[PDB]
Design an enzyme around this catalytic site. Sequence first.
Site, short mmCIF file in Angstrom:
data_model
loop_
_atom_site.label_atom_id
_atom_site.label_comp_id
_atom_site.label_asym_id
_atom_site.label_seq_id
_atom_site.Cartn_x
_atom_site.Cartn_y
_atom_site.Cartn_z
N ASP A 84 0.65 -1.54 0.13
CA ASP A 84 -0.17 0.11 0.26
C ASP A 84 0.24 1.12 0.13
O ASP A 84 0.13 2.57 0.21
CB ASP A 84 -1.16 0.27 1.25
CG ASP A 84 -1.91 -0.98 1.30
OD1 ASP A 84 -2.18 -1.36 0.11
OD2 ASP A 84 -1.99 -1.89 1.78
N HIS A 126 -8.59 -12.10 8.33
CA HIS A 126 -6.76 -12.52 8.29
C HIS A 126 -6.32 -11.10 9.02
O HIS A 126 -5.12 -11.57 9.66
CB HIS A 126 -6.41 -12.86 6.95
CG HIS A 126 -7.02 -13.82 6.56
ND1 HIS A 126 -7.31 -14.89 6.77
CD2 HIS A 126 -7.92 -13.37 5.42
CE1 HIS A 126 -7.59 -15.49 5.68
NE2 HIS A 126 -8.20 -15.00 4.63
N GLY A 134 -4.45 -10.45 4.18
CA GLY A 134 -4.89 -10.92 3.26
C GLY A 134 -6.44 -10.01 3.14
O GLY A 134 -7.55 -10.01 3.37
N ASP A 161 -15.78 -18.40 4.89
CA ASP A 161 -14.97 -17.56 3.49
C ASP A 161 -14.35 -19.11 3.39
O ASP A 161 -13.85 -20.45 3.68
CB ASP A 161 -14.06 -16.42 4.37
CG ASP A 161 -13.57 -15.85 3.52
OD1 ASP A 161 -12.14 -16.78 3.21
OD2 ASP A 161 -14.17 -15.06 3.22
N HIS A 163 -10.83 -19.23 2.98
CA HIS A 163 -9.99 -19.02 3.72
C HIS A 163 -10.00 -19.58 5.00
O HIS A 163 -11.11 -18.91 5.56
CB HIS A 163 -8.98 -17.45 3.04
CG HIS A 163 -8.59 -17.66 2.29
ND1 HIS A 163 -9.75 -16.55 0.72
CD2 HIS A 163 -7.87 -17.55 1.14
CE1 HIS A 163 -9.23 -17.09 0.05
NE2 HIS A 163 -8.47 -17.62 -0.27
N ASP A 250 -16.51 -15.83 -1.50
CA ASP A 250 -14.94 -16.31 -2.23
C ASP A 250 -15.05 -17.51 -3.28
O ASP A 250 -13.97 -18.13 -3.47
CB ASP A 250 -13.40 -15.47 -2.22
CG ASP A 250 -13.07 -15.63 -0.24
OD1 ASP A 250 -14.19 -16.58 -0.19
OD2 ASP A 250 -12.41 -15.46 -0.07
N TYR A 289 -14.51 -11.53 -4.57
CA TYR A 289 -12.77 -11.28 -5.31
C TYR A 289 -13.82 -10.89 -6.44
O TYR A 289 -13.56 -10.15 -8.44
CB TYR A 289 -12.13 -11.34 -5.95
CG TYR A 289 -11.83 -11.27 -3.95
CD1 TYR A 289 -11.12 -13.00 -3.61
CD2 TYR A 289 -11.25 -10.13 -3.91
CE1 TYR A 289 -10.79 -12.76 -1.56
CE2 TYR A 289 -10.82 -10.39 -2.58
CZ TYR A 289 -10.63 -11.33 -1.42
OH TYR A 289 -10.00 -10.90 -0.31
C1 LIG Z 1 -2.80 -11.81 -6.63
C2 LIG Z 1 -3.00 -12.27 -5.23
C3 LIG Z 1 -2.18 -13.54 -5.35
C4 LIG Z 1 -3.52 -11.80 -3.95
N1 LIG Z 1 -2.34 -11.18 -3.67
C5 LIG Z 1 -2.48 -9.74 -3.28
O1 LIG Z 1 -3.10 -9.38 -3.96
C6 LIG Z 1 -0.64 -9.36 -3.45
C7 LIG Z 1 -1.35 -7.91 -2.25
C8 LIG Z 1 -0.04 -9.30 -4.42
S1 LIG Z 1 1.06 -10.00 -3.64
C9 LIG Z 1 0.89 -10.84 -2.94
N2 LIG Z 1 -0.74 -9.83 -2.11
C10 LIG Z 1 0.91 -12.10 -1.94
C11 LIG Z 1 2.71 -12.48 -2.20
C12 LIG Z 1 2.95 -13.39 -1.26
C13 LIG Z 1 2.12 -13.75 -0.27
C14 LIG Z 1 0.72 -13.45 0.08
N3 LIG Z 1 0.46 -12.62 -1.46
C15 LIG Z 1 0.08 -14.61 0.86
N4 LIG Z 1 -1.27 -14.08 0.78
C16 LIG Z 1 -2.66 -13.85 0.03
O2 LIG Z 1 -2.40 -14.68 -0.76
C17 LIG Z 1 -3.52 -13.36 -0.03
C18 LIG Z 1 -4.25 -13.96 -0.95
C19 LIG Z 1 -5.70 -13.23 -0.41
C20 LIG Z 1 -6.66 -13.46 0.04
C21 LIG Z 1 -8.32 -13.10 -0.06
C22 LIG Z 1 -8.83 -14.27 1.62
S2 LIG Z 1 -10.21 -12.82 1.95
N5 LIG Z 1 -3.69 -12.10 -2.16
C23 LIG Z 1 -4.08 -12.69 -3.43
O3 LIG Z 1 -4.82 -13.82 -3.30
K LIG Z 2 -12.82 -20.18 6.14
ZN LIG Z 3 -11.09 -15.24 1.10
#
Ligand SMILES: CC(C)[C@@H]1NC(=O)[C@]2(C)CSC(=N2)c2cccc(n2)CNC(=O)C[C@@H](/C=C/CCS)NC1=O
Ligand SMILES: [K+]
Ligand SMILES: [Zn+2]
Length: 361
Positions: A84, A126, A134, A161, A163, A250, A289
């Site tokens: 951010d 989260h 997340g 959810d 997750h 989701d 999403y």
């Molecule tokens: C692009 C996609 C993977 C997206 N990611 C992102 O938009 C960003 C902000 C960009 S790269 C990243 N985060 C990232 C990098 C390494 C590890 C993680 N995230 C672990 N976190 C998640 O996987 C949360 C996961 C969302 C979970 C919602 C739970 S209601 N996010 C994502 O699906």
């Molecule tokens: K859940």
């Molecule tokens: Zn989720």
Amino acid sequence: LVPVYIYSPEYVSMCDSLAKIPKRADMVHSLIEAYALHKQMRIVKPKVASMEEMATFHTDAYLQHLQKVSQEGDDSIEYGLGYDCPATEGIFDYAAAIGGATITAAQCLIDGMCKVAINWSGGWHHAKKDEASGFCYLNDAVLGILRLRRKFERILYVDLDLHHGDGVEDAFSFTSKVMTVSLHKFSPGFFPGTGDVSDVGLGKGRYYSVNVPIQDGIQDEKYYQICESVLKEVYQAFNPKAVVLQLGADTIAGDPMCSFNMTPVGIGKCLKYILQWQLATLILGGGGYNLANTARCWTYLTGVILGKTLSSEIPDHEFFTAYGPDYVLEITPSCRPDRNEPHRIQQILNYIKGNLKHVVI
Ligand SMILES: CC(C)[C@@H]1NC(=O)[C@]2(C)CSC(=N2)c2cccc(n2)CNC(=O)C[C@@H](/C=C/CCS)NC1=O
Ligand SMILES: [K+]
Ligand SMILES: [Zn+2]
Ligand SMILES: [K+]
């Protein structure tokens, strides 16, 4: 008693102010408004959470950092805000509005204003006490539960959810006054990595955490069978006095996550079973999403709470163009295989059933 619906035009705009999920809160309310469901609910303006209210779970160091960067901007400490950097100044006000809304809804429950209070813009499960995670910058679910603990002796948190609601579970891991139940995808490498069936809580809170690991491609019928089976056992053993229900969309077919293969009708059955308990119930949103599908789901679920069957045709409104090419409310499951083996499922249910035998109030 009519359900309480946490809403204000200022609240909705604030929920979309980070643009992490562009205009979702507006799309959700607009669809609900287009079906005129808000006419049948009691609209309640959300209050803004104070520093002290947010500090009931989140650390001062984390909260003071958010307030500072809101005023001055971004070997720095790791608060999970690394995504951010272009805009951190609006996070504090977002968190305060999110936190305040869920607290407001919880207070409505305490005041006996209603049996069901709705905050579709909440459910950010989260977020840790000292870091964002997340897309969750503040755990309003935890703040909501803590508020309800002032009135109700035992609280059941149900997280549907996609997750694992790790932020909420860890917050109450050591207590037996709050039981967390989470249904989620569990696989090596899948966010957030925790929530195996063997994770049952710690100390006095041992066996007061319930996790249901599920595999890709599950559909309505199987999901509800699993969910009802668990909730049936959880309700009998724990005997909750209030429920906080997280309904992340989701899991729904068409979501970019592309894991579960659910429709809003399947989630609606789980909701219907919980509402049947007729307990004080705090309804929260969360993940979701696929914008239009998330609006579709939460609008349908709002109809379920009101006990109304909505017309299949999406009514003309601000975001009508986004609901193509079918422009209907119903969501069709994808042509994707179910990876859940029946024997594995029964094992998990039996495992949980054994755990809940230890739970006695
Ligand atoms: C692009 C996609 C993977 C997206 N990611 C992102 O938009 C960003 C902000 C960009 S790269 C990243 N985060 C990232 C990098 C390494 C590890 C993680 N995230 C672990 N976190 C998640 O996987 C949360 C996961 C969302 C979970 C919602 C739970 S209601 N996010 C994502 O699906
Ligand atoms: K859940
Ligand atoms: Zn989720
Ligand atoms: K617990």
